[PDB]
Write a structure and sequence with these properties.
17 strands, binds cobalt (II) ion, tyrosine catabolism (chains A, B), alpha+beta, about 375 residues, 2 domains, dioxygenase (chains A, B), cytoplasm (chains A, B), homodimer, globular
Chain lengths: ~375, ~375
């Protein structure tokens, strides 16, 4: 059931901002590995003496990569005179975030009708303020509240081209890469305590519970906006298992709560994964180990109604996982961690079904692949021995 | 003249170590952009709880990329019990270096006959110690002294595979990229005062002056080992010119002295530059703007004895610069800065002549291209107007 209790008008995911040590190298790596175009910049060449910010896009997906310059460049500036294009930016907060967590997501940004009212309403309803509403060039309003750990939920609203102060990138340096990724489907946080985290976030957004889950080492629940196009799962560790909780491992290496994974919807997951896997060992992203043949043998029985034998064979070539709800079918695969620490990673997704446009969350988040993978693995060792 | 006054036995450049925020993303970017293989690692997967270090190689060139993990992972360790594979590493020094300078070279490493004696002799002769000699696995000795700014000269010596504690990389993740780069030719520092810097470095190494230079905005001089295979140019700004000194701009954005550029010798600079330029806008490195056609028209007159018209045309397609000594010919080109700040960049080089093996420094460092580029530029505006 959907109570449509959003406390303000939320539209869609707008962008994800990574806080980096060197935004140039991370952005160029991500661009090649994921097939995202360099679309805009704000840096020394645009008059920004405070931070370097580079924007990559693929369809509606926007990845922002930001790093600080030497504070000495802007020592005579004050906030009213700043050259920063993102006025919430702070040298000290960025260096401390990166020193503490390594490469990771600082901001999950959603587009709202009015960022000033979204901020006021959120804070009125328990949100911890992070950056007050600031109007950029009389055109865009941005505001930030704490989401979990040092991750902020960023509100952006447009009177009506990413942000004022950003410039479109010289087309020679903007190669039209595209591997099929089109938008952000969901963004997942890891926290030490799910209950309080859910209460806090649902408390100030009015987002409703979309789904929930739980021998796995985690509990999770999904918060969703009114039309369920903004999906925010949150995980907590479950202690006392044979294997150490993967969520606990995250918290230890991340020094606490933070963003765990970004799920990127592809319009053609076969082509996305072919293109990404071709580049894994030449600067791109690695993928988790593939399921055994027994997993794909059991897929025929599970989704032979949705996917032909040839489409299943292509899933097996690419390592793709498949889960199915009572409403839709889900194709998914996970990258290895994006950087040095075993913390943040990316998920590639495509959903089948729930046509009306496709409704958000169609097919769930893969809750059935725990059971299937474990059963798959038991049955594969059996064939190997036998 | 060469006095061969080295105070200890120096062999060749061994490796360059970058200090990073995320070594994974910088290494993968450099690998694709420069055509370097992933050759070894020391990280969590090898038992190193302190730092992540990834080694790229192309021929004899070795680029090491190192970043710190959370100190919490190694909080129970002490130096005698450390899991760090590079015992000079310090979380605090690395974060402070990166916070102050951004992405850049921490260590210029040279192979010597005996790193312990090289360290003792250097310190006896005025070198500022940075890390005392440490024997790794009874096989490799490493020691460090200050070179300039926060850059160290690292001595490595082998009894007799990069360093103990490093593991060869899984061949699936080691794609055999190769664009023709084969070794490090020279490494150039920027300092505020050339005289004292030269005195200090020549004082503890016994390296001799190989070359010197100087309206350019800089003074430079080159220190060289006995056989002149280790070449260490150093630049200082010259203040009071129409344009601000490029060296001064470096010092301001780098927060002081540091490594300015690495010159990488190619065995086929045409193929290296074709391969690198193909990748500039898809995750690789950008190049400085090419000289005008007038520069290449005047090359026929200057090196038509060394390069055919077709070889000159290929230089013009690729933006390659050409200088010539009384002893050899030099082909060279410069990248844009490697990261966010207008600080460190790379030079690709190939030398022609001085055969005996080829003697180091063959053809100089491009001192004639100041005059030629300026004259080239004046003559090109002339054709445009006319
Ligand atoms: C929110 C999200 O994005 C998620 C994700 O992408 C991958 C899924 O795998 C699991 C698993 C297992 C056995 O792997 C589990 O035990 C629980 C309790 C769980 O909740 C999930 C999933 C469905 C999930 O939540
Ligand atoms: C040491 C090194 O590697 C160097 C480099 O790679 C590029 C060269 O260009 C110049 C220039 C000009 C006009 O560009 C100059 O005025 C001076 C005094 C100079 O000393 C050099 C060079 C030769 C140099 O030193
Ligand atoms: Co997911
Ligand atoms: Co040079």
């Amino acid at each position: 059931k959907n109570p449509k209790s959003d406390k303000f008008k939320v539209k869609r995911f707008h962008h994800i901002e990574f806080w980096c040590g060197d935004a140039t190298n991370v952005a160029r790596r991500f661009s090649w590995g994921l097939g995202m175009r360099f679309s805009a910049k704000s840096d020394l060449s645009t008059g920004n003496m405070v931070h370097a910010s580079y924007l990559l896009t693929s369809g509606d997906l926007r990845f922002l990569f930001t790093a600080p310059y030497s504070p000495s460049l802007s020592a005579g500036e004050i906030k009213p005179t700043t050259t920063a294009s993102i006025p919430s930016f702070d040298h000290g907060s960025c260096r401390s975030f990166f020193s503490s967590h390594g490469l990771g997501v600082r901001a999950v940004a959603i587009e709202v009708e009015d960022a000033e009212s979204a901020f006021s309403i959120s804070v009125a309803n328990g949100a911890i303020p992070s950056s007050p509403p600031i109007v950029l060039n009389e055109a865009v309003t941005i505001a930030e509240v704490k989401l979990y750990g040092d991750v902020v939920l960023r509100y952006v609203s447009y009177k009506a081209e990413f942000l004022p102060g950003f410039e479109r990138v010289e087309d020679a340096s903007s190669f039209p890469l595209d591997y099929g990724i089109r938008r952000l489907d969901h963004a997942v946080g890891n926290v030490p305590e799910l209950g309080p985290a859910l209460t806090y976030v649902a408390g100030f957004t009015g987002f409703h519970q979309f789904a929930e889950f739980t021998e796995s080492g985690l509990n999770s629940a999904v918060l969703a906006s009114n039309d369920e196009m903004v999906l925010l799962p949150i995980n907590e560790p479950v202690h006392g298992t044979k294997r150490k909780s993967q969520i606990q491992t995250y918290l230890e290496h991340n020094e606490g709560a933070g963003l765990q994974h970004l799920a990127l919807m592809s319009e053609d997951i076969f082509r996305t994964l072919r293109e990404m896997r071709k580049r894994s060992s030449i600067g791109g992203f690695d993928f988790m180990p593939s399921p055994p043949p027994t997993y794909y043998q059991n897929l025929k029985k599970r989704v032979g109604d949705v996917l032909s034998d040839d489409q299943i064979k292509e899933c097996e070539e690419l390592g793709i996982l498949v889960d199915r709800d009572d409403q839709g079918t889900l194709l998914q695969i996970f990258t290895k961690p994006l950087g040095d620490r075993p913390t943040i990673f990316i998920e590639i997704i495509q959903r089948v079904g729930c046509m009306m446009y496709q409704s958000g969350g169609c097919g769930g988040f893969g809750k059935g692949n725990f059971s299937e993978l474990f059963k798959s693995i038991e049955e594969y060792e059996k064939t190997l021995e036998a």
